[PDB]
Design a protein around this ligand. Structure first.
Ligand SMILES: [N]S(=O)(=O)[C][C][C][C]C123[B@]45[B@]67[B@@]89[C@@]1%10B81%11B698B746B814B562B%10%1143
Ligand SMILES: [Zn+2]
Length: 257
């Protein structure tokens, strides 16, 4: 099945998922001098004070930190969004080297990694129904550069040894995702898709301008994860990013001047 290798990677996905060649695919290159400032855009509202993490999972493509989304707790609203979107999970995409790893690019710059905080539109009742809708998800994307450590990331880094291989999970309670945010909530936004199969065109993308800094040691520990299951030949979980896709005349809007 699909993955990130030479034989099953992004250039192959269209054979099982023909929407891969669709009109609103993600990620994209963000051309900062073509993105227009939109004074009608609102500040983003990120309300994570009551977020309740449950578990961390290696799904063979990345690791997901999962949240209890049974009540109205950790929500994203404002910005370009109508209504309220509930946090379900976050995950990352990263490289084999510090020069690559992000999915979105900024004037063709690749960051070392990219964090995706995934939220579903509460008007559709659950995530499975939301992904069938053009406004079903809002994904908050945050770039990572290598420099100073991110203290709020370390709890995640430290549990990775316990989920090395595909299908392993571990309890992961009381993790506060506020510790992964940069200082500024300035953003770009555009309509797009999931960046992994099934590539559904259901996402309002909100990409923060300000990267977070993580240490070399932190990202090195991401690169010790495995795509394979326990008892299978080791293949390091690196370069789990889809490259930029055609913009197809979509407009990217900026919240800032
Ligand atoms: N990389 S990304 O931020 O565009 C979303 C990555 C996985 C998308 C999924 B959607 B909901 B949850 C997870 B499971 B289920 B369906 B299934 B597809 B995958
Ligand atoms: Zn993602």
């Amino acid at each position: 099945h699909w993955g990130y290798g030479k034989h099953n990677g992004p250039e192959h996905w269209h054979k099982d998922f023909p929407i891969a060649k669709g009109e609103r695919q993600s990620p994209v290159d963000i051309d900062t001098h073509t993105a227009k400032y939109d004074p009608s855009l609102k500040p983003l509202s990120v309300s994570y004070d009551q977020a309740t993490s449950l578990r961390i999972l290696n799904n063979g493509h990345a690791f997901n930190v999962e949240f209890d989304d049974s009540q109205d707790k950790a929500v994203l609203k404002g910005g370009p969004l109508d209504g309220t979107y509930r946090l379900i999970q976050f995950h990352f995409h990263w490289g084999s080297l510090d020069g690559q790893g992000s999915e979105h690019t900024v004037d063709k710059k690749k960051y070392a990694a990219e964090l995706h905080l995934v939220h579903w539109n509460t008007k559709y009742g659950d995530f499975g129904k939301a992904v069938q809708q053009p406004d079903g998800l809002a994904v908050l994307g945050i770039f990572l550069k290598v420099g100073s450590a991110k203290p709020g990331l370390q709890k995640v880094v430290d549990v990775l040894d316990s989920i090395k291989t595909k299908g392993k999970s571990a309890d992961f309670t009381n993790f506060d995702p506020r510790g992964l945010l940069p200082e500024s909530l300035d953003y770009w936004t555009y309509p797009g898709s999931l960046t992994t199969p099934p590539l559904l065109e259901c996402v309002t993308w909100i990409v923060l301008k300000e990267p977070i800094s993580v240490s070399s040691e932190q990202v090195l520990k991401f690169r010790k994860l495995n795509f394979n299951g326990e008892g299978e030949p080791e293949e390091l979980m690196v370069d789990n990013w889809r490259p930029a896709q055609p913009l197809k005349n979509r407009q990217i809007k900026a919240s800032f001047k």
